[PDB]
Design a binder for this molecule. Structure first.
Ligand code: SAH
Lengths: 6, 221
């Protein structure tokens, strides 16, 4: 699904 | 392939172990960004509408939902538009729960294909639309290239592929915990080009928070 910035 | 993975068996085995613990729910499919499901679905509907229905555009009889999970995209995007939808996912547990999750809409689901996509051949010239959402990052470059080429052969006349996924701003991100690679635009477009597909249209997803990787929709054939 959606994923946070690294 | 831009990145070769030596150890594709271990790579794909780890994704399976990851999805064994993912709840078979809309929130589970969204990875605890359930608040983004609605803006995701609303943008997908409008983008679909641009490329479906009309002379030269894709027809409305049959769609394929790739990496369907329990069928969130089928339920709210595809089944309201197409006369029949088929699901393909590697997790039998998600496919079985799809029958309950889809409620009455599941009466238009013709087949639940339990395959990994890199081992799947979309039925020849069967689909008006092939939807590929939040699963392309799990295929290696070699396997995604091959799978996109096979999707093209699964298209009826005037059919299209819709690819919707995270696109990293710069470079790529390898996630060892779920065996995924978030590609950047240049890598993804190169793979799309090399598969024989052309971009008919592209759109950035709106309404997502800034701390998220951008999401893009592409219409291809
Ligand atoms: N190699 C592979 N082949 C087929 N399915 C895969 C796969 N790797 C991961 N998946 C499936 O991809 C799905 C990603 S979660 C996203 C599900 C759906 N596209 C949605 O947007 O709601 C899971 O159902 C998982 O089982």
């Amino acid at each position: 699904g959606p994923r946070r910035r690294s | 392939s831009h990145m070769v993975i030596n150890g594709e068996m271990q790579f794909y085995a780890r994704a399976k172990l990851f999805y064994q613990e993912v709840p078979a729910t809309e929130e589970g499919m969204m990875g605890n960004f359930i608040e983004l499901s609605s803006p995701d679905i609303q943008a997908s509907q409008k983008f679909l509408r641009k490329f479906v229905g009309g002379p030269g555009r894709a027809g409305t009889d049959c769609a394929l939902d790739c990496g369907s999970g329990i069928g969130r995209v089928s339920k709210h995007v595809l089944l309201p538009v197409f006369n029949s939808v088929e699901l393909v996912d590697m997790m039998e547990s998600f496919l079985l729960e799809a029958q309950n999750y889809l409620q009455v809409k599941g009466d238009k689901v013709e087949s639940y294909h339990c395959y990994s996509l890199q081992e799947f051949t979309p039925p020849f010239r069967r689909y008006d639309v092939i939807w590929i959402q939040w699963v392309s990052g799990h295929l290696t470059d070699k396997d995604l290239l091959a799978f996109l080429s096979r999707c093209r052969d699964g298209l009826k006349e005037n059919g299209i592929i819709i690819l919707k996924d995270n696109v990293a701003r710069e470079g790529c991100i390898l996630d060892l915990s779920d065996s995924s690679v978030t590609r950047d635009m240049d890598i993804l477009r190169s793979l799309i080009r090399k598969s024989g597909l052309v971009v008919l249209g592209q759109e950035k997803q709106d309404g997502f928070p800034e701390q998220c990787i951008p999401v893009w929709m592409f219409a291809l054939h």
